[PDB]
Design an enzyme around this catalytic site. Structure first.
Site, PDB file in Angstrom:
ATOM      1  NE  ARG A 194      -0.293  -1.342   9.582  1.00  0.00           N
ATOM      2  CZ  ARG A 194      -1.055  -1.575   8.536  1.00  0.00           C
ATOM      3  NH1 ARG A 194      -0.510  -1.982   7.398  1.00  0.00           N
ATOM      4  NH2 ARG A 194      -2.361  -1.393   8.622  1.00  0.00           N
TER       5      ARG A 194
ATOM      6  CB  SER B  70      -5.306   0.635   1.958  1.00  0.00           C
ATOM      7  OG  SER B  70      -4.309   1.339   2.668  1.00  0.00           O
TER       8      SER B  70
ATOM      9  CB  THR C  41      -0.547   1.515   6.832  1.00  0.00           C
ATOM     10  OG1 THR C  41      -1.835   1.811   6.287  1.00  0.00           O
ATOM     11  CG2 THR C  41      -0.449   2.143   8.220  1.00  0.00           C
TER      12      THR C  41
ATOM     13  CG  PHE D 190      -0.544  -6.414   5.837  1.00  0.00           C
ATOM     14  CD1 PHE D 190       0.512  -7.207   6.228  1.00  0.00           C
ATOM     15  CD2 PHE D 190      -1.826  -6.912   5.983  1.00  0.00           C
ATOM     16  CE1 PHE D 190       0.293  -8.505   6.738  1.00  0.00           C
ATOM     17  CE2 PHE D 190      -2.047  -8.188   6.473  1.00  0.00           C
ATOM     18  CZ  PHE D 190      -0.971  -8.979   6.844  1.00  0.00           C
TER      19      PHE D 190
ATOM     20  CB  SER E 261      -1.312  -0.021   0.079  1.00  0.00           C
TER      21      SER E 261
HETATM   22 NA    NA Z   1      -2.259  -0.611  11.802  1.00  0.00          NA
END
Ligand code: NA
Ligand code: NA
Ligand code: NA
Lengths: 246, 246
Positions: free
Chosen positions: B232, B97, B188, B190, B49
């Site tokens: 994170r 996202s 962020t 992932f 992302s």
């Molecule tokens: Na998070």
């Protein structure tokens, strides 16, 4: 913008705090505004610190402010608030409402250019009498809550008579709450406690972006005691919370 | 990147949680960065992302994204998360996202233009091969934490190969925390939980503007269980809190 309607059920939040004031809330997609008090929504008050919004735009348009990375240096001579006695960015000066930074900006803009831009912006009664570095704090400039939301809508749409770049710069400077679901841009103002039976004004103006909707708002209230100043945010916040917006 | 210095005093924030990861923190500029792990600071991982940042700039530069008021309409067909099954603004798509919105942006940009811009941006290994709508998700694109802070510094300074207008639009979409004292822009990422003996990667990258100072940061960590994902943000937040930044 498109229509306005009185909703007197919002008076509950004013009555609970014994506040005389107005809230105007406009929904962009329906082009419709609501207020608790149509009469006061059209009444015109000193903008105080809310004038930092146009002043910043004008400073950027005129080149008085170079760009968003300019640092307004502190000369070490005392200022009225300890929070102002330091170097500030444009965002920092707006966020702490550093009067002397914006007085110097206005002085360098000058009366002729300031007059021209307030005309282009349709800002208030456009009366800058009272001194170039004080017309918005103690001079003759007045603006209503309805005019505030009209101005803020134009800023949001990048439709002011300024570059999109400089409108974006000032918008970034005005962000005050960020959540994943919504973003708030806002600015406070406070003219002071006023005279006997001639109270000052406090303002909170801004807009909320939520989902694909945008809500423009402007609050003002009579104020004769600094202790009431937090109500300029908490009353409008409770109304927008009851509306499901924040 | 001038020089990268190791700082051992952050390791306790990783070991407490049994996390293998890296934090890179640079004050003022990428000339002087600090990290807990010199080797991992420059190790390259799938951006996931975090790629939405360059992808949005390129979308705007190419005109695939018309402007910051573009609405990405949901066609009503199932999407992998319910939070994506709605019309989204650019900020909305970034904040939740919304992969499919950025997949369609990437498809319209096309491979030739995408390759040209990652080269201009010096964006990691610049490998977009394998499928224009998934190279940052499961393809061969790789970028390190050091390269992330260099790219984000260029974006902060409006020095990417893109109009300043479009850089400002994307920066506004990345605001995630606003306080009178400081402003955080972040994203962020992932990649997933990986496969046997091969964990995924989780990221948090951004910058903090405080007083007249700016801090660029990039965090990544191995992850093989979604339950670990909040680390994170919490590990780097705790580091930056102990540094006095937020
Ligand atoms: Na998070
Ligand atoms: Na309006
Ligand atoms: Na999907």
């Amino acid at each position: 913008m498109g229509s306005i309607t009185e909703n007197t059920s919002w008076n509950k939040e004013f009555s609970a705090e014994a506040v005389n004031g107005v809230f105007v809330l406009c929904k962009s997609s329906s082009k419709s505004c609501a207020t608790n008090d149509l009469a006061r929504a059209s009444k015109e008050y000193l903008p105080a610190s809310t004038f930092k919004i146009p002043n910043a735009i004008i400073g950027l348009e005129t080149g008085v402010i170079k760009n968003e990375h300019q640092v307004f240096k502190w000369d070490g001579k005392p200022r009225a608030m300890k929070q102002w006695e330091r170097d500030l960015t444009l965002r920092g000066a707006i966020q702490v409402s550093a009067v002397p930074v914006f007085q110097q900006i206005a002085r360098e803009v000058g009366e002729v250019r300031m007059q021209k831009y307030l005309k282009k912006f349709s800002y208030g009664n456009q009366n800058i009498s009272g001194g170039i570095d004080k017309f918005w704090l103690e001079g003759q400039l007045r603006i209503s809550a309805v005019n505030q939301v009209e101005f803020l809508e134009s800023l949001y749409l990048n439709k002011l008579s300024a570059s999109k770049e400089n409108q974006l710069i000032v918008k970034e400077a005005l962000v005050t709450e960020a959540a994943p679901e919504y973003l708030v841009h806002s600015k406070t103002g406070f003219s002071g406690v006023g005279t006997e039976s001639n109270p000052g004004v406090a303002w909170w103006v801004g807009w909320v972006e939520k989902e694909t909707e945008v809500y423009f708002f402007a609050f003002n209230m009579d104020i004769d005691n600094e202790s009431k100043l937090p109500l300029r945010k908490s009353i409008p916040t409770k109304i927008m919370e009851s509306e499901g917006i924040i």
